[model samples]
Target: EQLSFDELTLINLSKVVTVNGHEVPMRIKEFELLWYLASRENEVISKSELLEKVWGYDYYEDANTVNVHIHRIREKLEKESFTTYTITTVWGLGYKFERS
Candidate 1:
């Protein structure tokens, strides 16, 4: 099953939660990251995999980058209208997008 958010299509766990009928703008990397996580849904996606796929390199040492992006995504998704759904951190492992 796939998820669609207005014009912004996404896989399962992907839902276009709009505010005022307008889709939130996400950066290319952010969208890709979200897409990947949403595709996997409840699965824990490792940071190494995120770096390999999203960053495209193993040498990238800036783990904080992922944290920042995740924070941004959470904030965007948690806006007034869409505060119900959010991303959960898996303590020392990775992250997951879960619906509350």
Candidate 2:
């Protein structure tokens, strides 16, 4: 997926996100969030998992937090590249990282 089979983007463990040599600028939190989700590739993840992974807090339960972050991430990334993959929801679940 990192090889641009779908114009895909990649996020490194260093919190760096590059799409076809284009670097996307985002906050540390945003980078971490995307990094975690992208690391799992095309898997569905729960909100609690996201909270625990990204913010380092296991008990955080504000659903809006995840929603806002996802929105912000999509907005930020979309502005830079057309976005190879997409971030979407699973309805009754939390979120899913759909990679092409």
Candidate 3:
């Protein structure tokens, strides 16, 4: 299925989750970050590209921001409702959405 974005829903690991259903609330940037990563599906997305695409060049220097948001997203997905979707960190790279 083609990926689609909505203000209240995020598609990942073949599941559609209403953002509000998450155990923890997602900040706008966090939602955008996860949405972007999931939209790319199995592709490995780099930190640089994510910053450029999600935060844009003007906010590029805030690379650490990506880590913080990713951490939050991981935490939310770790909840019982969405534990099956693994948002694995790539070490010296970024993150990927995996199904396990």
Compute each candidate's TM-score over C-alphas.
Answer: 0.74, 0.78, 0.71
**Clash pairs for candidate 3:** none
Task: Give per-residue CA lDDT, model 3, range 2-100, as digits (tens).
Answer: 343332356545445564445345667776788888776666777878888889878736447777778888777655355545567889877787664
Tens-place lDDT per residue, model 1, 8-98, is 3453344443444566877777877887786676788777677678868755565687778888887887664565446788889998876
Residue 46, candidate 3: Cα error in Å is 0.9
- Global Cα RMSD, each model: 4.3, 3.0, 5.5
Model 3, 88: alpha-carbon shift in Å? 1.1
Worst 10 residues of 1 by lDDT: 4-13
Ranking by TM-score: 2, 1, 3
Query: Per-residue lDDT for 67-94 in model 2, tens only?
Result: 7898998898788765668788888798
Best by TM-score: 2
lDDT of each: 0.69, 0.73, 0.66
Model 1 alpha-carbon drift over 4 Å, by segment: 5-21, 58-63
